[PDB]
Design a protein around this ligand. Structure first.
Ligand SMILES: Nc1nc2c(ncn2[C@@H]2O[C@H](COP(=O)(O)OP(=O)(O)OP(=O)(O)O)[C@@H](O)[C@H]2O)c(=O)[nH]1
Ligand SMILES: Nc1nc2c(ncn2[C@@H]2O[C@H](COP(=O)(O)OP(=O)(O)OP(=O)(O)O)[C@@H](O)[C@H]2O)c(=O)[nH]1
Ligand SMILES: Nc1nc2c(ncn2[C@@H]2O[C@H](COP(=O)(O)OP(=O)(O)O)[C@@H](O)[C@H]2O)c(=O)[nH]1
Ligand SMILES: Nc1nc2c(ncn2[C@@H]2O[C@H](COP(=O)(O)OP(=O)(O)O)[C@@H](O)[C@H]2O)c(=O)[nH]1
Ligand SMILES: [Mg+2]
Ligand SMILES: [Mg+2]
Lengths: 428, 51, 115, 439, 428, 429
């Protein structure tokens, strides 16, 4: 009865989320026409966490896809699994954001936010009990970061006790692809620290080093980097849909993880990621899966967490495994390494197991780490914002429609403390 | 685990087939286009002499 | 005169770019005269099989027009929603209020309203 | 839906528009007489011609363009040339007697009789179609109607439309290569409207195109047809992300905010990198990382100013063809590795990147080659400040002896407008100074 | 149960290292794809020491191959057996080594020291216990010296308890393969003494000695020179690996040989060697085996054993063999001459006899011998190095690397005391 | 990883980059069309299976470009590397460096900056020019001056033709061949000298071909430059490179002067006899009475000896033949090198070229020794610069564009100090 709603935001979220429904529907066994043709029997037993019913026994996914340009909605509808979405559930404006966070927060997107919520109140009416919403956006552009934030602060106010979850493409340090990035990213963390229950840091530079050094690909396009994120969003909530031993839902992973209510910026990673030459050479055992979770390469955020202590650590294993090999292997991390762990929590590890593996693997995991190294990309974003704002480099494109300048030095007030809050909890 | 192994090798075979196809057909089409250049060049030279 | 024969192609290219002989509107290679003006050199020759585009990625808009005809969705309905139940049963139906709404198990010792 | 309107002014701008509308017609399937040539053959997935054409009732596509001239002879080659059966005959607006190298004629006394026509014909075009990304006009500095009527068109078109974007394309005089003695008097005095009333004003010199052809290509003695074909491949690369979809696409709104820091620094450059003779394209590679290192070479710029003297404020990169996104990010960090390529102290990000799947098309009879890859590098640079330093010196040297002034002052022009233009460009030589030093 | 991780570096380390795990897998019986090809079940007991059980009946090398130059990687993958090697275990650098220790140890060792050490810490952490360790590398060449001896010190901080060990190659002291190899080899062994626990060194002059006068086999290549080592360096770890009558560890033989843990310099060589012409004339008895390790006709390394006394000897064996004439042969070589043996300490030997011989040989053996003869090769180096340090020519390469001229004089006094340490242990 | 990107400067440089690239392009299977990964050392790749040798054909005389291009190998050496000047420099360091040399740096910057992107890891630069000609002494000088500022520590070795003391081709050539090496001791790593009199000596008495052209002398340099950089390209018994002997043949940053000698110079009348043993071919290296610089070593210092080998090579006879070199004392003993050798072994035997000059060869060895014999035979050119700088000859064409008379004695004191330090190195250590 515990079901969720999958909002998609911006143009980066529509590459993530359109690949998200080609992974879930692979798992639940749905054709592109929307009719069940699957193998096993408990596979559609919990189909109602995500999907919905229609006439004649056809299943439609539930979502709402927003954009400020109409080009992406035609691209999603012409996708491989693009037939199953309802045509009422697409909402889109007519004039693009133009990489302007202020246009996508005040003048170009606020006409649309009164029409997305009419879709959302129609999908949240149909529930038995909502577990929480879900959003996918990008912290680099205009229409993912502005209006995708304006969805959050209005959904949270009118659904206050649901477990809001997000997935964020944090901008890169220096290998970047927009001139006006730090105005776009520092103005979004100001409204993302106080309105989200969990938020994930997805570097686009740690998502290339995976695709060179542990997968050894040749031409890593965007078609598979959407897939690496879309295996983690399936991996966190496998405990929600499928049975097992020591299940842990979308909410019970939040309670164990965030010790103080401003420190909810995580860093994920997926455990068996093996090069296709070395598929013959990996050994399927539980300890070999664990050394990939805590390896510094499979961190998928922008900072190496050996520069500090983990605060709390998750591990959502999937498959068939003895749960003695689960609870012993996490202990051997906390004793071999001791200085890299916070010592006023006597056990830093939450575990979970479910019995239904991903399609085509024996077992898989999903690492979640609330490391204290995440202050580092908060300094590098803030240092590239206090150099622009010394002499007002690009400011007149944002100021001219109604944003005064004091909402920019208010942002670093709500940003330079959050650099410090990781430092006081770094030690003693 | 063995059926995963054959799936891996199948993807290797598909990749090398596609690479050799792209190399072969695009070099042949380049040769075709350059013969077209030679023909058009000689026609324009004859036009110059006629004028 | 058939560009899939001469060049390989992506199989979704339209027939206009497939067959180049239909572009009949261009100039017809007149032998030169002295009174040959220079601005007339623009567009003086028809395209041939070599110059057709190999791939084509145009932006269709048929779905976007046929969805955004009229207006976008907006809720103008009366406030219809059932407050659901916490317990999972099709017979047991309790909410935050009305916690005593269930089928009573048949107690032998006394009627069930006496605890 | 996502359209643009191309307004052509003057003898230079019309002969750009003879080259553009040849090249957009080749990019779609459109014949020179309209007539989408499909005959009883089914097809699905189209409408990539809404940005520059209009499908009418008979099935004949007519583009959105007005052609403005004050000269009769230039436009009447179109009315009798091959493309006569394409333009609507009200949209080839023709003047009667020309400006004859005169700002004062083209802005005060001859364009008054004609401005009522063009602003009726533009409003007919825009009311017809849904949106408007922005106009893309074409003109030239060194002539009368190219800089007079253009200075009167832009003052009137920024009032009654406003918030719809504009672009601007220029022909800029050389240090050496000039065609008129009136050339400095009107390339100084045309900046009273291309500062206030233009959102981006691109800059193209005749001299570097005269030199880029002799060095990359095996061509000598290139005429004006070969200059028009190159600038047709810029306008068909800025707007290529509107029509043909891509992995990372920039609209006309998108690169406007990533490229001009302050609202009086809108004078970017442009370069086209894989320019190569069609014999030489057989030889080299022209990779994904080869053609981005060529954008910053001083031999392959567009205005003859040394790029190793200024500091680059912003760069927008417009890739075209089969480009992968890992190879782009390998290229950019290599440029920031080298320390003879200079970026301003308050801009560590640096770049904006766009990628389209459509390969750059070929033109028949064109000396450009067929290459799978292309890029058009937009940049705003402090080195263009040293490009007015050879035009202010050619203006006050003229003005002190008061040569060639009595034509302007007899046509409704006052002498207080000459020296007012000189201070308004000597002010801008400090705006491009004051944002140059470090903090 | 006991496991072994392998670190391996460079070009000459790879060529010895590609042959080693080719002839490791002969007695383990491993397919050139990698699956089981055991001919008996006593040969499949502690195959887990070197191999991880990859699934399918598969087995992989627990071995890390690094190189800073990919141009000698193809000499390894295109070998006769080079399909076992895992591609994640390959990591390759883009900058050349330059035939230099200082470039390879300071400059180009700096970038990739964290990349190798995190992978080695990845593979060694999954051990239940690491018994022994090795490295195959050279001293006459750059990154085999540079990256070879840098990484022994970096794991030395993290893993100080487990036993590391060195299979090294001195460059040829008779005919040079780099002109100024006292700069390469002596600056790399200066790191190596405190880096490692023990040192195995074979030289090519003892290798060309055997095939010329003793084996009667003209024209040996580097595949013949790699056949007197790659069974030798698997010939000491026998009794841990294949079960025997008198089984011994790798650490425990390194425990029983010495009362004083200061010095460690060995010389390996394989015992059952005689000419293929003399293959049927000369297979007589186990005394014929013992009359090869003792005699210097077998030269193990370049140093001649007849120069000085032996503080100890050690003679391991594989295969079922006698006991009373083991007792006889250590007595009859004592009585005739006692100049080899020290006259103070009477007991020296460590006779570990196994049950399992290799295929094709019945009575196998390996000799590790400690004496004062390693002094001799360093003494002509102390006639080589002082001829070239009094003029300081090639040091103009070495000033700009990142070091001064004071590491040169200090490191030679870290060796010239050891020459004095050997010569006063030899006396009295 | 193995790539020696080059650049040609000169009529001499492009004639050598014709007739050494004969053997370079017959070592691989590229017929002169440019069509069909050892090739990736030199040849780039297009998309469509076509190549460019990573080289630039810089020269200011406009004749050598057309004469090279009108050969068989027309579209092989592709025409955009072909950098042509309008008027030649004509024995003038001032013309070739200052008044015409500054004109084409903007071209050479493109054509050497774009080549760096097309290799995996760039090894270094071998460069081709000559000393008795002005534009081959000037652009090479200014090339090193700009490039070692911009890049720096990349490998830089020179190919050139040095005036042997008997015969020469220009009058005042000890001027222009002694000014241009004020930058080869600064911005480059090593230097090759090959005088053509030392090839005219050998091309009669080791191949029985009287009257040899310079295009026959352009192929024994090919039979050097094959085995020198060919060890990079093919996995031998020990895969040796050029940064290797960049380190190994340089004891001081002043004395980088190796001596090149290749073993198989035998006729088809002589090929009925040589057994191609390692002993006889290494004798054909280390008996310098028949080698490629005309200086007898019997007053020189026998320091550093790199020996490269191609073909049917056995290490036991290599280590017997280098030991055989170490037996006899007529090659004596330098003090501070005890052994000072290098063995390099490569498994592609060299290619016999049609139109070539000798018969079937199985075995190859080439030697580069550092020896002070030609360092003390530098004193002849050093002493006879003075006999023409006693009387102020030819200076007027030099001095007009920037060869002022101070530099003419600056180079003199700079290069007298070089001999004064040669004498102290030749004083026993
Ligand atoms: N790049 C480029 N510039 C051109 C071209 N044709 C003309 N020009 C420029 O146009 C300038 C002349 O200005 P115009 O716009 O033609 O002014 P005009 O039409 O002569 O003015 P009137 O004679 O009064 O009609 C010359 O200086 C050229 O630089 C062309 O085809 N390409
Ligand atoms: N061995 C050999 N020597 C050459 C070759 N080409 C030119 N030379 C030598 O070069 C010397 C003079 O030629 P260059 O050095 O090119 O002088 P140049 O012709 O003035 O040079 P540029 O003016 O730059 O073209 C003569 O001594 C020749 O011996 C060649 O192909 N092989
Ligand atoms: N992970 C991922 N990132 C993407 C993809 N497409 C675009 N991006 C990122 O999105 C950022 C810019 O996004 P943008 O298009 O401006 O998002 P928008 O503002 O919502 O339109 C860039 O940093 C890209 O790295 C994708 O398919 N996957
Ligand atoms: N025994 C043996 N020695 C080798 C092998 N490869 C190289 N060597 C020796 O290594 C020494 C120097 O070789 P070099 O290539 O310069 O060392 P590297 O650069 O570290 O690989 C020489 O004495 C060679 O005899 C091999 O496969 N086996
Ligand atoms: Mg005009
Ligand atoms: Mg010349």
């Amino acid at each position: 009865m515990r079901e969720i709603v999958h909002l998609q935001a911006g143009q980066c979220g529509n590459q993530i989320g359109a690949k998200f429904w080609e992974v879930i529907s692979d798992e639940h066994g749905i054709d592109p026409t929307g009719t069940y043709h699957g193998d096993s029997d408990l596979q559609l037993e919990r189909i109602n966490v995500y999907y919905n019913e229609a006439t004649g026994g056809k299943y439609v996914p539930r979502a709402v896809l927003v954009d400020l340009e109409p080009g992406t909605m035609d691209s999603v509808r012409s996708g491989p699994f693009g037939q199953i979405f309802r045509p009422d559930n697409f909402v889109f404006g007519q004039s693009g954001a133009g990489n302007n966070w202020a246009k996508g927060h005040y003048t170009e997107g606020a006409e649309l936010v009164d029409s997305v919520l009419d879709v959302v109140r129609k999908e949240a009416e149909s529930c038995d009990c909502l577990q929480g919403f879900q959003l996918t956006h990008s912290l680099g552009g205009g229409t993912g970061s502005g209006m995708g934030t304006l969805l959050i602060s209005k959904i949270r106010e009118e659904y206050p006790d649901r477990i809001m979850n997000t997935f964020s493409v944090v901008p890169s340090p220096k290998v970047s692809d927009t001139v006006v990035e730090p105005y776009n990213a520092t103005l979004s963390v100001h409204q993302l620290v106080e309105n989200t229950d969990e938020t994930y840091c997805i570097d686009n530079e740690a998502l290339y080093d995976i695709c060179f050094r542990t997968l050894k690909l040749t031409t890593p396009t965007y078609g598979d980097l959407n897939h690496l994120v879309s295996a983690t969003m399936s991996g966190v909530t496998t405990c929600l849909r499928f049975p097992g031993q020591l299940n842990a839902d979308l909410r019970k992973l939040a309670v164990n993880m965030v010790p103080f209510p401003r420190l909810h910026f995580f860093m994920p990673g997926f455990a068996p990621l093996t090069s296709r030459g070395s598929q013959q050479y990996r050994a399927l055992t539980v300890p070999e899966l664990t050394q990939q979770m805590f390896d510094a390469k499979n961190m998928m955020a922008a900072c190496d967490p050996r520069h500090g202590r983990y605060l709390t650590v998750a591990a959502v294993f999937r498959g068939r495994m003895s749960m003695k090999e689960v609870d012993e292997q996490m202990l051997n991390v906390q004793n071999k390494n001791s200085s890299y762990f916070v010592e006023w929590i006597p056990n830093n590890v939450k575990t979970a197991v479910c019995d239904i593996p991903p399609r085509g693997l024996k077992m898989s995991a999903t690492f979640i780490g609330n490391s204290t190294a995440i202050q580092e990309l908060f300094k590098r974003i803030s240092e590239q914002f206090t150099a622009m704002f010394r002499r007002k480099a690009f400011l007149h494109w944002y100021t001219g429609e109604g944003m005064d300048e004091m909402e920019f030095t208010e942002a670093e007030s709500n940003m330079n403390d959050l650099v410090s809050e990781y430092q006081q909890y770094q030690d003693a | 685990n063995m059926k995963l192994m054959q799936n891996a090798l199948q993807s290797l075979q598909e990749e090398t087939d596609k690479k050799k196809q792209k190399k072969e057909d695009m070099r042949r089409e380049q040769k075709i286009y350059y013969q077209y250049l030679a023909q058009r060049h000689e026609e324009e030279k004859a036009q110059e002499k006629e004028l | 005169e058939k560009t899939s024969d001469w060049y390989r192609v992506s199989e979704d290219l339209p027939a206009r770019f497939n067959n180049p002989a239909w572009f009949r509107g261009y100039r017809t290679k007149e032998p030169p005269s002295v009174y040959r003006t220079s601005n007339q050199a623009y567009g003086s020759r028809a395209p041939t099989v070599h110059e057709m585009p190999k791939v084509f990625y145009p932006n269709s808009y048929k779905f976007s027009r046929q969805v955004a005809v009229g207006g976008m969705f907006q809720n103008n309905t009366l406030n219809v929603y059932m407050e659901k139940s916490i317990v999972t049963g099709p017979d047991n139906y309790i909410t935050s209020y009305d916690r005593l709404n269930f089928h009573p198990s048949y107690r032998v010792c006394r009627p069930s309203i006496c605890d | 839906m996502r359209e643009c309107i191309s307004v052509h002014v003057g003898q230079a701008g019309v002969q750009i528009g003879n080259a553009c509308w040849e090249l957009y017609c080749l990019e779609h399937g459109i014949q020179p007489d309209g007539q989408m040539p499909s005959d009883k053959t089914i097809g699905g997935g189209d409408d990539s011609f809404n940005t520059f054409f209009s499908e009418t009732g008979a099935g004949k596509h007519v583009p959105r363009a007005v052609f403005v001239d004050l000269e009769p002879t230039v436009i009447d080659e179109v009315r009798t040339g091959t493309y006569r059966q394409l333009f609507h005959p009200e949209q080839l607006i023709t003047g009667k007697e020309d400006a004859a190298n005169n700002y004062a004629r083209g802005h005060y006394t001859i364009g008054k009789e004609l401005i009522d026509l063009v602003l009726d014909r533009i409003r007919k075009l825009a009311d017809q179609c849904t949106g408007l990304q922005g106009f893309l006009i074409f003109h030239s500095f060194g002539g009368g109607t190219g800089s007079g009527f253009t200075s009167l068109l832009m003052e009137r078109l920024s009032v009654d439309y406003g918030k719809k974007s504009k672009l601007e394309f220029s022909i800029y005089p050389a240090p050496q290569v000039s065609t008129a003695v009136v050339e400095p008097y009107n390339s100084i005095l045309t900046t009273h409207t291309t500062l206030e009333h233009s959102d981006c004003a691109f800059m193209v010199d005749n001299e570097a195109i005269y030199d880029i052809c002799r060095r990359n290509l095996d061509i000598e003695r290139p005429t004006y047809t070969n200059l028009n074909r190159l600038i047709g491949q810029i306008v068909s690369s800025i707007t290529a992300s509107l029509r043909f979809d891509g992995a990372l696409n920039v609209d006309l709104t998108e690169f406007q905010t990533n490229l001009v820091p302050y609202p009086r620094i809108h004078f970017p450059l442009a370069t086209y990198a894989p320019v190569i003779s069609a014999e030489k394209a057989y030889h080299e590679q022209l990779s994904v990382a080869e053609i981005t290192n060529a954008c910053f070479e001083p031999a392959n710029q567009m205005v003859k100013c040394d790029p190793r003297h200024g500091k680059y404020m912003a760069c927008c990169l417009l890739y075209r063809g089969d480009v992968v996104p890992k190879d782009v990010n390998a290229a950019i960090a290599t440029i920031k590795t080298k320390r003879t390529i200079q970026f301003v102290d308050w801009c560590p990000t640096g770049f904006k990147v766009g990628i389209n799947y459509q390969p750059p098309t070929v033109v028949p009879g064109g000396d450009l080659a067929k290459v799978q890859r292309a890029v058009c590098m937009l940049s705003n640079t402090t080195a263009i400040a040293e490009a007015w330093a050879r035009l202010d010196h050619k203006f006050d040297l003229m003005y002190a002896k008061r040569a060639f002034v009595h034509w302007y002052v007899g046509e409704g022009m006052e002498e207080g407008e000459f020296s007012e233009a000189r201070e308004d460009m000597a002010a801008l030589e400090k705006d491009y100074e004051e944002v140059g030093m470090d903090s």
